[PDB]
């Protein structure tokens, strides 16, 4: 069975650092391209970042470029998102997503309401106290 588990998150002060871990089991991690998706409160799903099979290709959204770092470890079968310089508007629910097909460059419906190849996700709240 294809399952993805997300670890890390919670309450973080603005401008701090955080790490998100995505453990994947039930398939070949190396052969499938990975994605990160976040859902803000009251808004829809939006694509955050992607990493290729070997990690030679990485892309980011404009609101995140230079702030987050995405890496993958095939040996450990895990996917990471290193976040720093967080802002109050960055609070959202983060999902770890996988491209539906292997040996492919395109991912069509990753950012879909009823995607069946994404993990439960974790809550991240950038609120000062």
């Amino acid at each position: 069975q294809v399952q993805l588990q997300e670890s890390g998150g919670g309450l973080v002060q603005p401008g701090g650092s955080l790490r998100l871990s995505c453990a994947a089991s039930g398939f070949t991690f190396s052969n499938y391209k990975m994605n990160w998706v976040r859902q803000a409160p009251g808004k829809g799903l939006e694509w955050v970042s992607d990493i290729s099979q070997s990690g030679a290709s990485i892309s980011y959204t404009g609101s995140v470029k230079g702030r987050f770092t995405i890496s993958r470890d095939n040996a450990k079968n895990t996917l990471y998102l290193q976040m720093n310089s967080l802002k109050p508007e960055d609070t959202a629910v983060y999902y770890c997503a996988r491209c539906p097909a292997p040996f492919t460059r395109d991912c069509f419906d990753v950012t879909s309401t009823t995607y069946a190849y994404r993990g439960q996700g974790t809550q991240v709240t950038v609120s000062s106290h």
Binding site: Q1, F27, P100
Partner: protein, 341 residues
């Protein structure tokens, strides 16, 4: 509330996995070592059918293994004669986009469906000889993916909205609804006794449904990507499934788990259509890489290869008597392959 239910569900999956592991007495490959290999199989294209304008998406064989039905995206539904190559009917579809077609066991009616979400059925018993839309069914929100005939009055239909339906032709309304899928249902296969049918969806899982009660019996989860093709074993106690991950897997209903997986390192493309032979020893699976492969259901060895299509083989069918195999590709051509001595 959600946590206590999710933990219970996870415990249930763990219990089911433990039950599956406990009954795994041995491996199918291990007990088939003392079996003579099938060997190389050479099949030659006996008949070539041409006349479709657009790509062929689906086809179905007849009960008598004489007439076959083919559907193409141009909006044409042509009935071919395999022996003399003659064309018997050419129905101009109302909707050009058609994804499936079915041939009734009696041969009196022919069904079809596509992106219109409408299952159109045409009657061939008309005395005037002019085909007409006998009945139209509109109860599915998603795209029509597959459909199979139970009898002259009952039809099982698959849609892209994660729902399967059992329509009654005379009344034109759904009799039973199957809603247990999380992804688009691609294809389903009918058991020889027409009692149970299994359906493969985009959730990398296969579900067994009973026609009468309408409740799923078993769920199989052994694939890594979308499942595109499904077919029953001739004995009805097993079914072979094909997916995008370049792997065919055989599932046993009694064992409630996969028996063997047919995969090759060289093959990396998807699988579109799979079907068994009369005896079930051979498994003819149409692959995305412009050709079809004939696997051994027992030794997991490539018995033969059929490379006679200029594009992906969209559909593949085997006659009831197993005399010949008809393969339809996206090159608007239908190839009939028969073995030679």
């Amino acid at each position: 509330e959600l946590d206590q239910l999710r933990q219970e569900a996870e415990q249930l999956k763990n219990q089911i996995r433990d039950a599956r592991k406990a009954c795994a007495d041995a491996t199918l490959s291990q007990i088939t070592n003392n079996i003579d290999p099938v060997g190389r199989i050479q099949m030659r294209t006996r008949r070539t059918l041409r006349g479709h304008l657009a790509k062929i998406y689906a086809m179905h064989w007849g009960t008598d293994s004489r007439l076959l039905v083919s559907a193409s995206q141009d909006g044409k539904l042509i009935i071919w004669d395999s022996y003399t190559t003659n064309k018997v009917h050419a129905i101009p579809l109302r909707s050009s986009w058609v994804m499936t077609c079915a041939y009734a066991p009696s041969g009196n009616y022919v069904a079809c469906g596509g992106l219109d979400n409408i299952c159109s059925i045409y009657n061939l018993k008309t005395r005037e000889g002019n085909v007409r839309v006998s009945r139209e069914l509109a109860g599915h929100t998603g795209y029509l993916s597959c459909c199979r005939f139970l009898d002259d009055n009952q039809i099982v239909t698959s849609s892209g909205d994660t729902t399967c339906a059992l329509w009654d032709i005379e009344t034109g309304q759904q009799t039973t609804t199957f809603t247990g899928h999380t992804g688009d249902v691609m294809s389903l296969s009918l058991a020889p006794d027409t009692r149970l049918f299994v359906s493969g969806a985009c959730d990398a899982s296969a579900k067994l449904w009973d026609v009468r009660e309408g409740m799923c019996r078993q769920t199989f989860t052994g694939h890594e990507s979308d499942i595109n093709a499904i077919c029953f074993f001739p004995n009805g106690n097993a079914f072979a499934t094909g997916s995008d991950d370049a792997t065919c897997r055989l599932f046993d209903l009694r064992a409630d788990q996969e028996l063997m997986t047919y995969s090759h390192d060289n093959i990396i493309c998807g699988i579109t259509s799979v079907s068994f032979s009369k005896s079930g020893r051979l498994l003819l699976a149409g692959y995305d890489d412009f050709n079809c492969n004939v696997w051994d259901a027992l030794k997991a060895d490539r018995a033969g290869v059929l490379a006679g299509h200029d594009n992906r083989v969209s559909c593949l069918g085997v006659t009831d008597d197993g005399m010949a195999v008809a393969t339809g590709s996206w090159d608007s051509f239908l190839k009939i392959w028969n073995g030679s001595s």
